Amino acid sequence: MKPRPGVFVDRKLKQRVIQYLSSNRCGKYVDTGILASDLQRLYSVDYGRRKRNAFRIQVEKVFSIISSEKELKN
């Protein structure tokens, strides 16, 4: 078994997203479904997998959590 890198379940989705929003809007009013398709498009080699539905859910929950957990307000 491998140790704990730092990301659990799908922390990258949150960390990656928060970093994308902070750096820039990364789109005009990117919603859950929009951010998901965008995140996968830019990271088709990494995120781009055979989980369109699963990935969509992750981005949906990550979008709501990043706002409530981090709270950037723009």
TrEMBL record:
<feature type="domain" description="NVL2 nucleolin binding">
    <location>
        <begin position="2"/>
        <end position="71"/>
    </location>
</feature>
<protein>
    <recommendedName>
        <fullName>NVL2 nucleolin binding domain-containing protein</fullName>
    </recommendedName>
</protein>
